[PDB]
Design a protein around this ligand. Structure first.
Ligand code: COA
Ligand code: COA
Ligand code: COA
Ligand code: COA
Ligand code: SIS
Ligand code: SIS
Ligand code: SIS
Ligand code: SIS
Lengths: 260, 261, 260, 261
């Protein structure tokens, strides 16, 4: 029997999902196992557990962001500058490695999408506009970001068979933490401005690799080991539910004590 | 006979105010009628309907802003430059014509205040810091303003016996709208910088008079006439509740269709 | 006798015109009086005093710009939108009020014309391409204008019997000056884009009326009174030669001290 | 015994320096040897050979540009962002490796200085304003730069005892040349905007190291070998005089023949 909508709603509630929460999801469709109706039902079941008074958010980003063009031969870079489409929030596809579920939520009715191409988040529910509003282009995991707002409203992160190393929220802890040295990246990206394509430079902390000798999986496992979060099964998947505020506080302290 | 806290909470909920909303208030104490406990109870009842996870904001401005000193004679202007106090967000009083309720909210526990003196907004609640953060000095009703943020987070405007012409949000619609004519003003203002008084010049669109042949009352009356918002009584006052995003969109289209490209 | 080429050259040199200068001209043919060979000889004599290493520029604009159509009834506005020709820099005639000399210079061999229709400038000589390049559509008397470049390369303005109120350079001073009140206008204009007519909206400061209680005649006469420029006769005309940088600096200070 | 103004003027003229030319100088004071009156007289003799109808330019840059702060510990970077002064063109000192002569010219009467901090050029003479005008912040050795204008007005470059590897003009050839790959740098810099310090990001091609397996010394030596320029002694210094237009054309073809795609 493929997992049903009802069995998923009930499992989310059993794990601790409650009406009105703001929740960021990381998931693996394959870890959940076959669902009756496909991955839509994972999203709908989670939405139903949250009710319309709650909010569901995922990290979408942009699968085709051409942030790498300075490494290309100059003549090819020039073609990119002429021919590559800009980030259009209506069409820019989600990063495939963020789960097909992120692309499914990005194209969900009543979705809101944040404006930072590389860090773009999508949300559905009562606080979806709030979470995705005024997402600054520079330092997209920092103070002017959906992650800051998720912490401020005491939201949650649900890991649904997704590896612990993929928690995007810990990039916000990296932004906050006073560390010996953090790597800054400056990269090009085409956006829409007054309906026309414009290439801009985006400045951010590196989010492709850690700033020092740590991993997100290590921080998350240490968090679990000292009693943080709840754990349970949802479909076939091992699931973890974390409070965003407590996990961010823990991770900032973890980073500053080891690398400050 | 005076309106009670409970009856005000019920009236706000009947109008459509819900837990967690971000709400900007324009109000007349006299229009509401006598409240048991005074105007504090209007603010508290509204906060209670919003809950601490909602947010209540008002336009405070600065009652004593000396933005007029350029039209004084040189000798008097010199006295102002020397003697007028700077905008101190801890003490600068709210504009009296913004209702005593704005000054009451400005002095409420856990209030946050935006840094633009002339355009200063005050808020209490979960998004109060968010709404009031990084309020740019120039174009204070524009893209870096609490009004832009109220629109972005899909907040609301509540008119509680206040004239429709007083909706500050429509200055943000003026900022957004592409119009054949705009008046740009530069005016002086004393502020605090590194703990010291410094006189600066602020640039903004004129918000004292319209940029063309319209009024805010007209726009708002037209919005209501085509079904915008909800209406209901709160105390003795006729109240209107508007979605900030829908009203701004309507007002921008209204201005652009009449004066636009 | 009509004035000769040789006597005009001598008069220009006596006034202070030197080889290699970049010069913007405002002129009245009638004030100069009849010239042997007509107004062509005024331009050629000036070009000869400047030599090919100098540059001569004038304000052309567009005599037929339909910037007034938004105020017409819909039915007439519609006809303008469909039937009025776009700004074609090869054919768009200079504003007649700018002197026939501006249209004569616009049609001179080796002329360069700037792309802003309402603010269009025409130039012949060594820096003609430099002065007329990349003239932005918005704020056409501003930072991206031939007037800004004339100031930046320390060019000159020659008034050849033209009223001081007609100095276009003082609109650049208005743009630069920090003033208590500015009128900003948006108006329609047909242009060519990829060889097709397209209607665009242009944003600019109002240049039809001052922004406050002043006139250009007032500013320039004050400049002359404090020793600015040199004066002399050219033909029958009273002529004034101003340094573009010094006049702009003076006018900005004049505006800011009174309205800033 | 020390070299005199008159002998320096003649030595410059012997190379081909003429009245009215626009000339960019690279120099070593030590290579020239002691001059009667010091390095001022080198500049004045060159100016006198060029006459007031000519123009003299040097690369000043900014000795204290804090373009390296991202490599510092975060806490030290934070101090720089707060405390390091911005580029003020009235005071920012010339890079010392560009010769004390560049700082001497930067402080010369009637000097003009271009606005790009890292690439800042200083010039005195008839076309000094033109050469230094509207120097773009990004790609400061490219199309909107003093080097582009020096090429356009058919100016010259004089190497006065300076190593051929230090010719700034060849960074403009690097900018122009269609090469297989050029390294792009983006770096921070504090500037003045409306009288206040602002930190901005500057984008440019790398000018600290070549983009491929070449050196400027090698290009210039090849230019000389095929008959380009003139050479002679000025004081104790070996001098080279290059036409900017011909050298830029030669260098672009040189780079594209060897490293193009
Ligand atoms: C990388 C990772 C997503 C891979 O997980 P996964 O289960 O293999 O991949 P997805 O969740 O995208 O599911 C894909 C499956 O959905 C299924 N599916 C069901 N209906 C589908 C449909 N209409 N269209 C496409 N796929 C569909 C398919 O079986 C597909 O697998 P297939 O192409 O092999 O046939 C996962 O291990 C992970 O890391 N999750 C966390 C990711 C994250 O949040 N990163 C944030 C960056 S900070
Ligand atoms: C102008 C306007 C405020 C007048 O409304 P109002 O009801 O007369 O005035 P207020 O709301 O300030 O209420 C004043 C009353 O509060 C009462 N009050 C109760 N307790 C009070 C107290 N401790 N202290 C002071 N006043 C008190 C008083 O009776 C006072 O009236 P009084 O001084 O005549 O005795 C109203 O018509 C209006 O325009 N509101 C919208 C304004 C706005 O929001 N503008 C935004 C700018 S875009
Ligand atoms: C308005 C102003 C141009 C009128 O000056 P003017 O001397 O009367 O007019 P012009 O310079 O255009 O000269 C016109 C004369 O050129 C003569 N002329 C000679 N050859 C001519 C020819 N081939 N074709 C046409 N006219 C010719 C004609 O006699 C003509 O006069 P007419 O039409 O009455 O017979 C002048 O007073 C002025 O203000 N100049 C400054 C304008 C300016 O620079 N504005 C900038 C905008 S900010
Ligand atoms: C690096 C380089 C400048 C060093 O040359 P240099 O002759 O040693 O140095 P300078 O030209 O700065 O001259 C310094 C000498 O000027 C002399 N001098 C005379 N008057 C002086 C004065 N008032 N103040 C300071 N120094 C003075 C001093 O002897 C000083 O040397 P010292 O400090 O050892 O006593 C030279 O080899 C070079 O590379 N020139 C090319 C520069 C260039 O254009 N770079 C741009 C790269 S694109
Ligand atoms: C398209 N260009 C890319 C650019 O979008 C950006 O992507 C980041 C991505 O790698 C991060 O995932 C890595 O890190 C984590 C935790 N250590 C585990 C999985 C790893 N893959 C992700 N959490 C956040 C993304 N912003 O940085 C890298 C890049 C190559 O430049
Ligand atoms: C202290 N100096 C003043 C300065 O603060 C500013 O005040 C503005 C105020 O008038 C506006 O209220 C007018 O607008 C209409 C709506 N059309 C409703 C009532 C009208 N009075 C208000 N909505 C916004 C304020 N920023 O401009 C004017 C000024 C005199 O300079
Ligand atoms: C075609 N439509 C017109 C549009 O081109 C623009 O014309 C301007 C023109 O009037 C200005 O001349 C006035 O200014 C004073 C200087 N105080 C001298 C003479 C006055 N006539 C001129 N200097 C600059 C022009 N850009 O504005 C007005 C307009 C009607 O909209
Ligand atoms: C302050 N930071 C520095 C920044 O100003 C910039 O300096 C450049 C400078 O090195 C170049 O000189 C090198 O190259 C040449 C020919 N290959 C020979 C001498 C070499 N030293 C000079 N020609 C142009 C300068 N723009 O780049 C490097 C930097 C460290 O980032």
């Amino acid at each position: 029997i493929p997992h049903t909508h009802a069995h998923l709603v009930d499992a989310f509630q059993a794990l601790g999902i409650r009406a009105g929460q703001a929740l960021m999801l990381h998931a693996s469709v394959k870890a959940v196992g076959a669902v009756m109706g496909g991955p839509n039902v994972i999203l709908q079941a989670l939405m139903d557990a949250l009710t319309p008074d709650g909010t569901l958010m995922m990290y979408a980003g942009w699968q085709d962001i051409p942030d790498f063009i300075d490494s290309l031969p100059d003549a090819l870079k020039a073609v990119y500058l002429e021919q590559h489409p800009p980030f259009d929030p209506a069409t820019a596809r989600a990063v495939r490695e963020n789960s097909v579920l992120a692309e499914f939520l990005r194209t969900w009715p009543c979705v809101h999408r944040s404006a930072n191409p590389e860090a773009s988040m999508v949300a559905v529910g009562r606080q979806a506009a709030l979470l995705t509003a005024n997402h600054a282009l520079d330092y997209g995991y920092g103070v002017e970001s959906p992650l800051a707002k998720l912490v401020a409203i005491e939201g949650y992160v649900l890991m649904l068979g997704a590896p612990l190393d993929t928690i995007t929220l810990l990039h916000h802890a990296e932004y906050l933490a006073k560390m010996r040295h953090k790597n800054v990246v400056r990269y090009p990206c085409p956006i829409l401005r007054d309906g026309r394509k414009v290439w801009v430079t985006v400045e951010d902390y590196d989010t492709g690799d850690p700033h020092d000798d740590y991993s997100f999986e290590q921080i998350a496992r240490d968090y679990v080991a000292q009693g943080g979060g709840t754990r349970g099964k949802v479909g076939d998947a091992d699931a973890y539910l974390f409070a965003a505020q407590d996990l961010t506080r823990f991770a900032v302290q973890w980073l500053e004590s080891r690398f400050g």
